[model samples]
Target: NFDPRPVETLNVIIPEKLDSFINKFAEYTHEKWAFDKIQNNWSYGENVDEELKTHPMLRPYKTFSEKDKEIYRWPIKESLKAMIAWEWTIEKAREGEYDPREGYNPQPPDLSGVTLSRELQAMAEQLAENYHNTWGRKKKQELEAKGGGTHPLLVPYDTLTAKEKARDREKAQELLKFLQMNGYAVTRG
Candidate 1:
């Protein structure tokens, strides 16, 4: 039987509250459609070189010198906070723990007192937008090819072919490893 609960819950680093400027930037762009481009492009993962060459966000990442690329790390990590916060906020509202009528706070991730150049922030924002759009499409296509259907849940788990089941197991294992790497305590329950 398939379990709906997460295999493990990841307790992540929550930086101190963002300053006003960073807060404003997050407010305007929080929950914006960014995915983990770095993970997706890993050697064992999908190679999107051709697609990335033209991608607004990844194109810059491709050509930048190592020093210049380091500047993007902060914004990307901050974006992950926003993403997780949005997921948690929405889940809470659905469970009646958060009052939607009052407008629940997504509790976006903070960057403590860290500051980045305005120009760097702009580049990050642009990259985030492009990543959201491009990565989403790429993921969808990849999933469909793997017999995940238009939605993975479209077919019941018990009904899947052996090949499909193996694929699912591989994906689940990968997720567990990813959680462990990210400081999550994972266990089969």
Candidate 2:
């Protein structure tokens, strides 16, 4: 409802083409100006505005940090507002429609008025799968192969004290060496 041109202009006062500063002046100035306004609670409403009184954007007027409130000054504010409208009104959801780590549970989005990038979405999904494979499946498989049921490492899982269970590969090799030195049969598996 309110005009946002002033906010965007204020935030991007420096030209994007300017190469004088170490970082782009636009980026630095954008961060600095937006952060300044947000930190002082200038762009945000102290009390909810008439248009967005019941809206979630009003909830952060007081509790937000510099990072949280900076987006208000973006040129994309209208797009963001439209998304919020679609999320709250058309979709009838009380929460944000998307999150990065939403973890496989998401309501089907209403795409009638929205255009999603399938390529970007696929990339995001691939990255997530890579993360899961690295930290979850592959890691678990390795642990299971070395330390799971009926294995030498986990023979007495719960019964072994921490010190007894803290056997590294080197320690295991040392124990095997001791056994060999004592004339005990040692076979490589």
What's the TM-score of each model vs. the native? 0.24, 0.18
List model 2 lDDT by residue over 20-106, tens digit each.
221222233344443444444434344645454222242322344646544532323322232223232112112212232211121
- For TM-score, the strongest prediction is 1
Q: After superposition, how far is residue 17 of candidate 2 from its true place, in Å?
A: 17
- 74-183 per-residue lDDT for model 1 (tens digits): 45444445334434221111111122221122332323333434543433343343333333455566776886655554334445565755544432233222233223
In candidate 2, which residue ranges exceed 4 Å CA deviation? 1-115, 141-146, 149-189
Residue 82 local lDDT, model 2: 26
Query: Each prediction's Cα lDDT score?
Result: 0.36, 0.31
Among the numbered candidates, top lDDT falls to 1
Q: Lowest summed lDDT over 10 consecutive residues: which window, candidate 1?
A: 89-98
